[PDB]
Structure 1
Amino acid sequence: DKATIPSESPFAAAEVADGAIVVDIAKMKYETPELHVKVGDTVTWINREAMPHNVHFVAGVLGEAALKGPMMKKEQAYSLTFTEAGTYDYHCTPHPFMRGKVVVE
């Protein structure tokens, strides 16, 4: 499956775009916890603090296996391309109190 992965492992923040659809991570929070996007859209997480974070989608959300994203150090980003309408929940692997949700229309 229900999305695909640009990078397998994360990249410098710079390599961005501008007006790219982004979710900032700061203060132990995904800063947009309910992102509404469209099919084919690429969401980029950007880590803003020294504390490593990632995005983690359980088994049966993006396809049969769980997507356990890689940790982004301060000011790395990682992205994912959504490819089907539905709601996808994620959370950060060390920090399961940090939860978000990508709504694909």
Structure 2
Amino acid sequence: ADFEVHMLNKGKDGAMVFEPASLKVAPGDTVTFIPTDKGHNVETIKGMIPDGAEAFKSKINENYKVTFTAPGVYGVKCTPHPFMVGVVQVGDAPANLEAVKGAKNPKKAQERLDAALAALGN
């Protein structure tokens, strides 16, 4: 299955959001990150992807597709926008949950990450 996440200047959260900010997928599913507004990209957060996964970064304004196979959670962010974060989960029972939760990010970023994990049933 293929999923799309859009990058928007405004959400129910406030400024700068991935929509949806959380997605649970099966191994081998894909997500394409699609800027709706200009000035956004996507990249994995340092330390916040599973063993077996590779890091990634898109260019500003680029449509960017990623295939997720390694099981676990994947914290993603948008470079120019500090609060703009999201979580992709592959499978149930992710093993690197504490890598996202135990992080010490700006409050707003951390609450968005924590909310994403909780919405994923963790």
Structure ranking higher in helix proportion: 2
Tell me the TM-score range normalised by the shorter chain.
Answer: 0.5 to 0.7
Counterpart CA distance in 1 for 2:44 and 2:71 is 19
Structure 2 distance, partners of 1:23, 1:63, is 23
**Cα distance in structure 2, aligned partners of 1:102 and 1:26:** 17
2:54 matched to 1:72? no
The correspondence for 2:18, drawn from 18, 26, 30, is 30
Relative to structure 1, the CA distance from residue 78 to residue 62 in structure 2 (aligned partners, 3 Å threshold; closer, same or farther) is farther
RMSD: 2.4
Instruction: Check 1:63–1:25 CA distance in 2 against 1; reply closer, same or farther (3 A cut).
Output: same
Range 27-36 or range 57-66, more displaced: 57-66
**TM-score, with structure 2 as normaliser:** 0.59
Q: Secondary structure at the match of 2:5?
A: strand
The residue number in structure 2 matching 1:94 is 80
Counterpart-to-counterpart distance in 1, 2:44 and 2:36: 18
Matching of residue 40 in structure 1 with residue 7 in structure 2 = no
How many angstroms does 1:57 deviate by?
Answer: 3.0
SS of residue in 1 equivalent to 2:79: coil
SS in structure 1 of the partner of residue 82 of structure 2:
coil
**1:21 equivalent in alignment to 2:7:** no
Q: Percent identity?
A: 33
Distance 1:39 1:33, change over 3 A: same
